[PDB]
Amino acid sequence: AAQTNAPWGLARISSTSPGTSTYYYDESAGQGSCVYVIDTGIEASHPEFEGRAQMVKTYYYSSRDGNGHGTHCAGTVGSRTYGVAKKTQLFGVKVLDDNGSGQYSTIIAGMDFVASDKNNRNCPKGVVASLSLGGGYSSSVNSAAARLQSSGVMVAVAAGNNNADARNYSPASEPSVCTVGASDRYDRRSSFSNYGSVLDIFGPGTDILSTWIGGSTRSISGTSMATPHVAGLAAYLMTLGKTTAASACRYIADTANKGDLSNIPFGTVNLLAYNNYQA
Ligand SMILES: [Ca+2]
Structure with missing residues (x-):
């Protein structure tokens, strides 16, 4: 399937390059999966x-x-x-x-x-x-996220918007979940995105068009916007049978666009979520 003039972030997660505007995806489109938005x-x-x-x-x-x-x-x-x-x-x-x-x-x-x-x-x-939430480090918050993941749910969490090491934020710092940083349409790390060894993946997070209340739409920015790109990608890949809830974060990291982001601090992954859809 092809959706023309899609939001840049959708186009980005099905592309090997920035600067395109069509989203390509298998028509199964996550049917039969479920995503909780907490x-x-x-x-x-x-x-x-x-x-x-x-x-x-x-x-x-x-x-x-x-x-x-x-x-x-x-x-x-x-x-x-x-x-x-x-x-x-x-x-x-x-x-x-x-x-x-x-x-x-x-x-x-x-x-x-x-x-x-x-x-x-x-x-x-x-x-x-x-x-798409979080605050300062809490072992209790991290252990709740760990339980959710252990129970058989693919957990994707925002890295946070502090331009700092995500080690100090929760649930971002829980190792066993999928911690998501944010990028912009020119493949820069978003200026506000947290970083660090606990990040698993980046997704589009600057100037993201989506739904809003009152039956409306708007563009906003944050690691909160990158996280649902990764969650939706996981659901899509699980419907296709490519991965499972326990393995999806690793699978996404394995299949990501690698080494393409700018302003990635040394020690932070340079991996950008990618659906590798090849009609
Ligand atoms: Ca992790």
């Missing part, structure tokens, strides 16, 4: 989700995304126009309030919720969780 919620009624999104848990008075951030991330995972895996099922877990923040105890509960809740969902091709 964030501010998802505006499921948005036509862009085509009925494939649903809120399954909130820790607040409502399950509505009153912020937009979670809707944007979900759109990069799986919206029809802005998504990597255009046929995946999306499940929203609202651990962040409408101001975009959440207590670590609530975030931990949401991770353990996903580890159990996947047993209530039909995901024959596998389960992914996208965590």
Whole structure:
């Protein structure tokens, strides 16, 4: 399949080169997989989700995304126009309030919720969780992310936006999950992206067009935007049978565009997520 005039990040993850605008992908498009978006919620009624999104848990008075951030991330995972895996099922877990923040105890509960809740969902091709959130180092937050991954979910987490070593942030610093840095359309490390030996992969994170609340769209930037590119890629690859939840981060790193990013500090991977779709 080919989607012309796609957001640059979609075009980038199916290309060996920057500077193109068509997204190429196998038409299976993540069908039969599931992605949990653990964030501010998802505006499921948005036509862009085509009925494939649903809120399954909130820790607040409502399950509505009153912020937009979670809707944007979900759109990069799986919206029809802005998504990597255009046929995946999306499940929203609202651990962040409408101001975009959440207590670590609530975030931990949401991770353990996903580890159990996947047993209530039909995901024959596998389960992914996208965590575009984080704060300072916490062994408890890291151990929750580790449990979620151990339970058979491909966990993708944002590296953080501190232009610093991700070793000091959680869940970014949990070794066993897939820690995602951000790049721009000219293949630079995004100026704000964290780095370090704990990063597994980079994805597009600067000026990313996706869905927003009120049935809308907008472009925003962050490692929060890179993470759902990787989560959607994992779902896509698991539907194709190329990898599994336990192995997807390594598979993505193995098959990435290698050595192509600029402003990568010594000791940080120079790997950019790539679907290696070759019609
Ligand atoms: Ca890792």
